[PDB]
């Protein structure tokens, strides 16, 4: 569920930092919204794997893991520059 927000992000890390918003035949401010759409949809996908102590568990209802939390903080700590 974290691999559904990653390839939207590394496209958004390209068209914004490199400033390549001159490709689309549509309005580029509009197509930027649909990319920031999926970066906001995918942020919700691991809202459900978060425990009560704000810790991330691998399976649904399973025990918490230090591996996934470090991977949940790697992914979410990168979306912060583009989605609040």
């Amino acid at each position: 569920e974290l691999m559904s927000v990653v390839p939207v992000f590394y496209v958004f890390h390209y068209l914004e930092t490199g400033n390549h918003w001159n490709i689309f035949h549509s309005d580029p401010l509009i197509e930027k919204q649909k990319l920031k759409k999926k970066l906001k949809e995918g942020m919700l996908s691991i809202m459900s794997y978060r425990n009560a102590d704000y810790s991330y568990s691998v399976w649904k209802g399973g025990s918490a893991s230090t591996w996934l939390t470090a991977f949940a903080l790697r992914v979410l700590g990168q979306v912060n520059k583009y989605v609040e």
């Binding site: 569920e1 949809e41 996908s45 809202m47 794997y49």
Partner: peptide
């Protein structure tokens, strides 16, 4: 408004 997408695993 845009359509709110319930996730593949929601609360």
């Amino acid at each position: 408004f845009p359509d709110f997408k319930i996730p593949s695993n929601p609360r």
